[PDB]
Amino acid sequence: PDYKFWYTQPVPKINDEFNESVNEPFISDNKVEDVRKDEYKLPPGYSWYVCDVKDEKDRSEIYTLLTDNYVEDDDNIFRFNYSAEFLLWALTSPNYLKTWHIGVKYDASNKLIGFISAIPTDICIHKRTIKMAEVNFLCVHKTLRSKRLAPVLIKEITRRINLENIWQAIYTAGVYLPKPVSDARYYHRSINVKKLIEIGFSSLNSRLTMSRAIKLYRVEDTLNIKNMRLMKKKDVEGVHKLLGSYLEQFNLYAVFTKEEIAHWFLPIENVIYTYVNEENGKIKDMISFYSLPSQILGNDKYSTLNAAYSFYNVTTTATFKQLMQDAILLAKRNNFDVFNALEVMQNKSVFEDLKFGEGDGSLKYYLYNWKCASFAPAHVGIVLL
Ligand SMILES: CCCCCCCCCCCCCC(=O)SCCNC(=O)CCNC(=O)[C@H](O)C(C)(C)COP(=O)(O)OP(=O)(O)OC[C@H]1O[C@@H](n2cnc3c(N)ncnc32)[C@H](O)[C@@H]1OP(=O)(O)O
Ligand SMILES: CNCc1nnc2ccc(-c3ccc(F)cc3OCCc3c(C(=O)N4CCOCC4)nn(C)c3C)cn12
Ligand SMILES: [Cl-]
């Protein structure tokens, strides 16, 4: 309601509205020379720590911080449990900066209690392509909440990003902040029906008994696209063209280089899954989803919901519904308990037919130091991890 920190930032106020003809920074003509070279002050006993995510132990420290203190669902059934290998993948995209992986340590115990990260990427917003920082994994230890640490983390990473002559950022959050460019409800498609019911996430009733639910969400183990296969390095050029052509229709997408295609789509077990359909030497269809377990809080039987998240999907030889049906089948074949997707790109058009259930909240999309018209989530063409 007050937004005492955010109203000091170059972001729209809660009731700011810009028309289609506006697509520019809040603050332009920025000079790297003018960026502060001193780190932001922390409370005494706390220190900045540049994390080396390629070091296993530094990476484990981030993993522990997030495992115990990161995002929980609105009902506190779940907490995200990003794997250490996933964090490596998420944070070492091409041209990434290790100095954008910022930790705060409590000196007395030498333990990480705060973290924020960013990676650089070209973001096309309303047909204008801007080098941006993609901010993610902001986390403050549960014991230090509501002490205004997050503004310090946000301001410090803003400074480090500005030092690289980058003045815009993209980020997402479940909380409402000034001010979303788009707002995206999330949906789920049950796969391990019995498990989702036992943990308390899915519901039954007289019409949907346990056995009828199991039958309803059972899938045929046959791809609509017969030759969908795991992506290999030979497909990077093909995927780059297919996805790149698909994404230009949207109001907000990342302009991937081939190097970025290789990093973000070549498969890593329990991290990122991409399947392709090659015809006549061309990649004509692609499915991708990443692995993001939710820890199941307090649950005696299960400690982990193995969830797959829809990443990027393009079809030219099938319908989008058949493609996503295959996406669900491919996630099941890989032992995921649930398939999750946002109402971005074409996704909403298949949610009813493919038996998705609507979730309880939404993911908001944001830009930093950019004013433009907002848009319905079907015009969003980017998924942040
Ligand atoms: C050009 C370069 C630009 C780079 C910067 C681009 C912007 C990047 C911004 C970051 C993108 C992150 C993307 C993701 O990672 S989204 C993931 C966010 N992380 C979690 O939800 C994990 C669980 N929660 C926590 O760890 C803490 O609660 C956090 C760290 C979230 C808040 O800490 P705490 O609870 O101890 O509060 P405080 O007293 O320190 O801070 C209070 C202030 O913080 C504002 N707040 C609350 N939640 C968020 C949020 N998700 N994004 C931005 N701001 C947020 C809040 O409105 C208030 O400001 P104001 O209301 O008074 O104004
Ligand atoms: C974007 N960067 C990370 C990030 N930051 N904030 C958020 C908020 C939402 C989401 C989110 C995004 C897409 C999606 F499709 C579902 C999503 O969230 C489901 C709610 C949920 C669940 C959950 O209900 N489930 C059951 C089904 O399987 C998955 C786990 N668990 N948690 C821990 C959450 C937050 C990501 N967010
Ligand atoms: Cl098959």
Residue 165 alpha carbon to ligand 2 centre in Å: 32
Peptide bond into 215 cis (omega under 30): no
Please tell me the experimental approach by which this structure was elucidated: X-ray
Question: Is there an atom of ligand 2 within 6 Å of 177 CB?
Answer: no
Question: Is there an atom of ligand 2 within 6 Å of 96 CB?
Answer: no
Q: Ligand 1 pocket check: which of 65, 81, 140, 158 to mutate, most ligand atoms within 8 Å of Cβ?
A: 140
What do you get for the CA distance between the two ends of the chain, in Å?
28
User: What are the b/e assignments for 75-105, b being 16+ CB within 10 Å?
Assistant: eebbbbbbbbbbbbbbbeebebbeebbbbbb
Residue 295 alpha carbon to ligand 1 centre in Å: 21
Tokens, residue 99: 């100095």
Which ligand 2 atom is at minimum distance from the Cα of 172?
Answer: 1
**Into how many domains does the chain fold?**
1
Residue among 97, 88, 44 nearest 62 (CA): 88
Cβ < 6 A, ligand 1 pocket: 3-6, 69-71, 133, 135-140, 145-151, 154, 157-158, 161, 166-169, 171, 173, 175, 177, 368-369
Domain of 122, in residue numbers:
1-385
Task: Give the resolution value in Å.
Answer: 2.1
- Here the CATH number for the domain that contains residue 307 is 3.40.630.170
Beta strand 169-173 pairing with 229-230: unpaired
Report how far residue 249's alpha carbon sits from residue 228's, in angstroms, rounded to the nearest whole number: 25
CA dihedral over 384, 77, 68, 63, signed as positive or negative: negative
SS3 145: coil
- Helices and strands in the chain, H and E counts: 8, 19
Question: Is there an atom of ligand 2 within 6 Å of 201 CB?
Answer: yes
Residue among 321, 306, 245, 301 nearest 273 (CA): 306
